[PDB]
Amino acid sequence: LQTIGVYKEGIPAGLNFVLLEDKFLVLADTTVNLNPTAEQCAQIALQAAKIVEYFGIEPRVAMLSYSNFSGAEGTPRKMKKAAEIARSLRPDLMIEGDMQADTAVNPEIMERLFPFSGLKGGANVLVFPNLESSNIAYKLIQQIGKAEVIGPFLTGVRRSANVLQRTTTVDGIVNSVVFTALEAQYIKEVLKS
């Protein structure tokens, strides 16, 4: 961070992949920012969407909360306002908040209870309101969900850069390198333009 830095409007953020039979879900930010502000949550999400768009998949984003659209003072307002910012920045993308978790990932719950929601087809990008929720969520899916989880990976830096954990296994080190290489190629291509 002290040497490479981030690009314009960047935020340093740790991201995971949850792998299912069909889709995968993207989790963030799980290592870096302790209690991210609304502006920050919208940026975490936007980056996560450039990343999912890279794999040719339509990104669907939920600002997670303990509430279904309360806008109430506190976390819900931060996340609701967060989504509002994120749409302000990329209007082609399906982004919403605030909403609970299950309300996110399941398009059926969404159409039954909040048919007004701009998010349909179930979320594929989950932004957390803070670090407690995201680290506990990802490590809990990994241990109980019995769906497979890779990461965490680093995002938002000017150049291809990535941090491992000490607990990282060899598999982890090699796929982590893969992403590093790719983002590097993506950097070169952004350069070409």
């Binding site: 509430s67 279904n68 659209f69 309360s70 806008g71 109430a72 609701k80 209870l113 909040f114 007004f116």
Partner: protein
């Protein structure tokens, strides 16, 4: 009026207003009067005002209600009273209606309110419209207009359904939609609790 009530009670405030103008009327018709009262309404008005600085103010006010009412087609403003079974509200409606101020619309069970109307022996308003929320035709039209207003403020479709089931929110929505011209409530509930729906 009957075998046990033949003459108005000694402490009846109406007494002055009813007898005095007829005494002046007789003193004039028989011609022993030396100064003529023409506007009978004005005489009575000043008779009322004659006791209470507020009354004259309120009397001026009502005069202004009638003034712009009769200038816009003789129409009376529709006013919603969510508390249709409220004793105090019924008793007020009583004195109100002979004043032709507004068209009162009460809320509650169509019969539990005429039950309370007949219970207070106040037949002045046997015919003022009384509406139960859950029964009104525009009811779903209403629950959705609330929904869009509060679906992002912690309300899903179900809670907006019961919330429009509350006479208060019902009054307010009625007003908002022009299905009523005004509302007044809270003779039963706390100022805060009653203001929140509005």
């Amino acid at each position: 009026f009957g075998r046990d009530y033949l003459i108005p009670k000694p402490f009846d405030t109406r007494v002055l207003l009813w007898v005095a103008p007829e005494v002046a009327k007789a003193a004039m018709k028989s011609g022993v009067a030396t100064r003529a009262i023409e506007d009978w309404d004005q005489y009575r008005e000043s008779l009322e005002a004659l006791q209470g600085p507020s009354k004259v103010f309120i009397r001026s006010a009502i005069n202004r209600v009638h003034q712009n009412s009769a200038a816009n087609g003789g129409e009376l403003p529709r006013i919603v009273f969510p508390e249709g079974t409220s004793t105090k509200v019924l008793k007020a409606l009583a004195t109100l209606v002979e004043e032709k101020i507004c068209q009162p619309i009460l809320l509650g069970y169509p019969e539990r309110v005429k039950e309370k109307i007949k219970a207070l022996d106040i037949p002045l308003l046997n015919d003022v419209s009384i509406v139960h929320p859950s029964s009104h035709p525009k009811y779903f039209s209403f629950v959705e207009k609330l929904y869009s207003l509060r679906q992002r403020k912690g309300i899903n479709l179900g809670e907006a359904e019961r919330l429009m089931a509350d006479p208060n929110y019902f009054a307010a929505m009625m007003v908002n939609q022009g299905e009523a011209d005004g509302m007044v409530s809270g003779s039963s509930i706390n100022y805060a609790d009653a203001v929140r729906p509005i």
